[PDB]
Amino acid sequence: WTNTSGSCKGRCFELQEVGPPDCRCDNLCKSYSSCCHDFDELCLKTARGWECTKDRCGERNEENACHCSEDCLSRGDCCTNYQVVCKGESHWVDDDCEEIRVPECPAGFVRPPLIIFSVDGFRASYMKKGSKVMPNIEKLRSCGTHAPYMRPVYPTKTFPNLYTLATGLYPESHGIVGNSMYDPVFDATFHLRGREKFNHRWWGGQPLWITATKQGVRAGTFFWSVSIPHERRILTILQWLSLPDNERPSVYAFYSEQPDFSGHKYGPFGPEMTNPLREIDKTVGQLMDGLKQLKLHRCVNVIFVGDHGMEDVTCDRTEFLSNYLTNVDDITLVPGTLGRIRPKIPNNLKYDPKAIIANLTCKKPDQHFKPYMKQHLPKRLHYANNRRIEDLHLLVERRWHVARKPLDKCFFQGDHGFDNKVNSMQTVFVGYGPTFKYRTKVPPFENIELYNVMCDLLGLKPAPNNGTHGSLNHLLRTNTFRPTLPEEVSRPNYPGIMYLQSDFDLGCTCTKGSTEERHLLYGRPAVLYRTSYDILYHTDFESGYSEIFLMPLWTSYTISKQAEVSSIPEHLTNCVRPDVRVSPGFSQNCLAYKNDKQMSYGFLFPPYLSSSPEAKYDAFLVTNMVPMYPAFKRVWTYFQRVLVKKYASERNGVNVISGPIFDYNYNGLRDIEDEIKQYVEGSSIPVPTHYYSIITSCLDFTQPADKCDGPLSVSSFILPHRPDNDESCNSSEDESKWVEELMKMHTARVRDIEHLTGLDFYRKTSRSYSEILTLKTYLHTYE
Ligand SMILES: *[C@@H]1O[C@H](CO)[C@@H](O[C@@H]2O[C@H](CO)[C@@H](O[C@@H]3O[C@H](CO[C@H]4O[C@H](CO)[C@@H](O)[C@H](O[C@H]5O[C@H](CO)[C@@H](O)[C@H](O)[C@@H]5O[C@H]5O[C@H](CO)[C@@H](O)[C@H](O)[C@@H]5O)[C@@H]4O)[C@@H](O)[C@H](O)[C@@H]3O)[C@H](O)[C@H]2NC(C)=O)[C@H](O)[C@H]1NC(C)=O
Ligand SMILES: Cc1nnn(Cc2cc(Cl)ccc2/C=C/C(=O)N2CCN(Cc3ccc(F)cc3)C[C@H]2C)n1
Ligand SMILES: *[C@@H]1O[C@H](CO)[C@@H](O)[C@H](O)[C@H]1NC(C)=O
Ligand SMILES: *[C@@H]1O[C@H](CO)[C@@H](O)[C@H](O)[C@H]1NC(C)=O
Ligand SMILES: [Cl-]
Ligand SMILES: [Cl-]
Ligand code: NA
Ligand code: NA
Ligand code: NA
Ligand code: NA
Ligand SMILES: [Zn+2]
Ligand SMILES: [Zn+2]
């Protein structure tokens, strides 16, 4: 029970959230039906609007939404344009950009406050409109630090992305995996409407306001109800900034439901989009004018950030499951720009997922969605390790929708939620203030990295998250994080020739300085876990061979622009040779591959790229072979025989690092021995879930990859090791029509491979460690 007979006089939007029986006056009191009786009258006043006019200058009526009185500067409740209209001051946007070398804060401000100004559905390309439509935002962008775009997380929806911005976590870790979700342990559904979202049980990880409070830094509200106009949200933030030193927060958030609302109705390029964009710019202007009025415009760090973009999507572009499935009444579909399927009744014995996927696979030539069991989704989405993510997922093609049946002019022209590499899904990032760099453009980056930066801007230690601390140090003038190189746990063994050909009963038949200088360009990768492994040198490649997995953890080799591709001679087709540096007890065997009728093998260093016939014999060593399904070999052989040479010709040589990945529990992390669920028949040779490659070259392509003096250029992938090519609808055609498209879909960051393998790359370069961390977060999108 709450005593609603109390008053909100002198308490409007207070930060101390009182509990029952005291009535509330904070911004969230309406959601819990606990506001005091006069909260709407005293705190949500709108009389005379939000702007001072000439006739209003010089007195005071408490009924006014904001004031134009001489005492309003002391009270901290002027309308944001008061100084401009009444005291001959200029608007912030009309003032020239002046570098902020150090924080210029009034007395009592120990650190520069942070204001996060978040905009829903603000597509990156909206920034190209410029100062014609958005001058305040253009001033922040050109004067501060900006990226051409920021990558959101998948699904590219509001709730997963705002919570990722707050925690630095992937949605699978923070638990907000969609705007709608069913949790089978709670036996409950979370939805935008409804009370379920208010229960803390859904919200995992540690959001910024909690990180701040636990470390003694105060926070303003990060949740604004729709019954509070934007002008009042700005005035409330300004009011809080005027509080006494022991009460004033250091971190604030502003949220706008626009341009997302108008984007859904009119499309991202509808002429109707101009007005909501100008209204967001005027809100930014009100904030900067109010900060200038407070002498805080050269003190506060401001982040202008979006959650996701917006794409043209209409009713006319909808695929229906009833066209592929006999029974859509027995399944529940979370629909739209993604699909998540589960039986209507949990654990229904008649649910046949194998038969459902089969019916949704390559059934139409222009099929505008692709089904996946969640562990088969591209690893860069990081969208599998949560009980709220249904096993069956549909990746929807951009501009399309998926629905259960036709019943479910269009009422909408825009939507979002698609794969986070889609261009229309990219959003904005601008940092402005004393701690951000001046007039600096930075490369595009992922929104999971912002939590570390916001913690840096506030002097906070971030809770464990998925950002790479130090990868965004180039955005900041000061408060950079001093990253520390991860300690190598296992030191390599360097075995010499110790065995004879006669020591092996495997059922098989058939210049270290120069190797390191040519094929290991950035030093040996560090093994960050306890294991036994051997460095093996060869003329054409170097490898880190695992005694536990019986295969390389990594294989490193350089292919120059003028390297020649050769064929495997007919007499060497089935050649596998024992390695006299590795014990028969620590080797794979050919008998297990012959016994396993579904599993064949491939090589990490390709025999096709040997530098000479004599050197080609090393490519056939048992220590260079890895288990591969014949369907996968079509992909791997095309990559090794055609694509590597193509990349070497285009990038002026390439350094390739390839190897296996074991991620049976789809958690994005290296499996321990116990978690590996498949082995080559009758053996202890584990079967990889994926195969990776990291392809590095010189950013200045006029210098060969093996003689590069400056920054590096990287592209990587994590290919699913699957027994069929069902993901590629055109895989009956020659590999030149489908393999590269499959690889582009499975593009990856080097950081994604490090998590999945327990290895640490680029340990020996002439580049700063912060630059290397940025290179490790790079994702080549092919957009
Ligand atoms: C992205 O970054 C995150 C954060 O660093 C990494 O996630 C962490 O992974 C490690 C290793 O697997 C986990 O450690 C284990 O933790 C448990 C104890 O876990 C409890 O306590 C911690 C600490 O307070 C808490 O964070 C945990 O929170 C999880 O569970 C909550 C209840 O279900 C849930 O509300 C919350 O969202 C979160 O769920 C996620 O994690 C669990 C696994 O912990 C997972 O099953 C679920 O599906 C979600 O993904 C929890 O209350 C110890 O008993 C173990 O011994 C071990 O220490 C961390 O718990 C985990 N932290 C988070 C926040 O997820 C990711 O690996 C990294 N991803 C990549 C790809 O690098
Ligand atoms: C979702 C998510 N995750 N974190 N946030 C916080 C947030 C974080 C950052 Cl980095 C920047 C800005 C914001 C602010 C967001 C915001 O004001 N709204 C309006 C209210 N609704 C509804 C609501 C949900 C749960 C509740 F308990 C109460 C209400 C959520 C959101 C759209 N939102
Ligand atoms: C509680 O509410 C009643 C009116 O419903 C009021 O008379 C009472 O004084 C309030 N409590 C306090 C402690 O003032
Ligand atoms: C799959 O489609 C066929 C028609 O091609 C239909 O006979 C069958 O019932 C469908 N199966 C499921 C599980 O929907
Ligand atoms: Cl919450
Ligand atoms: Cl196929
Ligand atoms: Na994700
Ligand atoms: Na402060
Ligand atoms: Na070496
Ligand atoms: Na794993
Ligand atoms: Zn949104
Ligand atoms: Zn939306």
UniProtKB/Swiss-Prot annotation:
The record marks 776 as: Essential for catalytic activity. Glycans are attached at residues 3, 359, 466, 730. Expressed in brain and adipose tissue. Changing residue 179 to A: Reduced lysophospholipase activity. Induction: Up-regulated in adipocytes of obese-diabetic db/db mice. A motif (Cell attachment site) lies at residues 75-77. The active site is at residue 158. The keyword Metal-binding applies. It catalyses: a 1-O-alkyl-sn-glycero-3-phosphoethanolamine + H2O = a 1-O-alkyl-sn-glycero-3-phosphate + ethanolamine + H(+); a 1-acyl-sn-glycero-3-phosphoethanolamine + H2O = a 1-acyl-sn-glycero-3-phosphate + ethanolamine + H(+); 1-(9Z-octadecenoyl)-sn-glycero-3-phosphoethanolamine + H2O = 1-(9Z-octadecenoyl)-sn-glycero-3-phosphate + ethanolamine + H(+); a 1-O-alkyl-sn-glycero-3-phosphocholine + H2O = a 1-O-alkyl-sn-glycero-3-phosphate + choline + H(+). 1-tetradecanoyl-sn-glycerol 3-phosphate binds at residues 158, 179, 260, 416. Optimum pH is 8.0 for isoforms 1, 2 and 3. N-glycosylation, but not furin-cleavage, plays a critical role on secretion and on lysoPLD activity. Secretion requires simultaneous glycosylation on Asn-3 and Asn-359, while probable glycosylation of Asn-359 has a preferential role on lysoPLD activity. Not O-glycosylated. The interdomain disulfide bond between Cys-362 and Cys-729 is essential for catalytic activity. Inhibited by EDTA and EGTA. GO terms for molecular function: alkylglycerophosphoethanolamine phosphodiesterase activity; calcium ion binding; dinucleotide phosphatase activity; lysophospholipase activity; nucleic acid binding; phosphodiesterase I activity; phospholipase D activity; polysaccharide binding. Disulfide bonds join 8-25, 12-43, 23-36, 29-35, 52-68, 57-86, 66-79, 72-78, 97-143, 105-299, 315-410, 362-729, 508-590, 510-575, 698-708. It holds the Pfam family Endonuclease_NS. Residues 521-783 are annotated as: Nuclease-like domain. 1-hexadecanoyl-sn-glycero-3-phosphate binds at residues 158, 179, 260, 416. The nuclease-like domain is most probably catalytically inactive as residues that are essential for catalysis in the DNA/RNA non-specific endonucleases are not conserved. However, it is required for the stability of the protein and the catalytic activity born by the Phosphodiesterase domain. Belongs to the nucleotide pyrophosphatase/phosphodiesterase family. This is Autotaxin. The gene is Enpp2.
